Amino acid sequence: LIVTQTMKGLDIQKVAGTWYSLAMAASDISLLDAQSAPLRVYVEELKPTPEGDLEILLQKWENGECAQKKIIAEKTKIPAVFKIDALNENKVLVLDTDYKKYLLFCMENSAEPEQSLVCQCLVRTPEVDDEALEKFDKALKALPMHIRLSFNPTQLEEQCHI
């Protein structure tokens, strides 16, 4: 069992724009282990829709190359929980954000969270934000993460983080 507390009072309209994947953590090492790992994805943009759905633009290393992927996240009755059908995941969980700097989110397959759970620390600008990383570490204290990756500014501005 993995219990998740998403942000009360999330306003998805205020997350719009460019983001950078500053850190990522996962319940299962193989989710993120190596360049090719299935949940090793680098968010480029969050585009909320007027009806409050969310388009996620990201990059993934696939056919020897750093590919662009587009995920349509459908809203639910909980503003911080969205339904997806991509990367073999079916939920997006928004843990926390201050809108102006950082956003913490997870993906999972609700049928098996332990085999599934990947969370990220996003920042709006390509700089290391110690505050955002401490919020990420705090948010993850109760999650059973077995791999954690933290990137430098050079990795932030790089195709698939090098």
Ligand SMILES: [N]
């Ligand atoms: N928050």
Ligand SMILES: [Pt+2]
């Ligand atoms: Pt908040």
